[PDB]
Amino acid sequence: FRIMRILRVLKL
């Protein structure tokens, strides 16, 4: 699962 892909979002 592309978890990092979602978490990285927080670092907008």
Q: What is the DSSP string of 1-12?
A: --HHHHHHHH--
Give the whole-angstrom CA distance, residue 12 versus residue 1: 21
From residue 1, how far is each of 5, 9 by CA, in Å?
A: 9, 15
Give the whole-angstrom CA distance, residue 3 versus residue 8: 9
| Distance, CA of 6 to chain centre | 3
Give the whole-angstrom CA distance, residue 12 versus residue 6: 11
Residue/partner pairs of 1-10 with CB below 8 Å, 24 or more apart: none
From residue 2, how far is each of 9, 10 by CA, in Å?
A: 12, 14
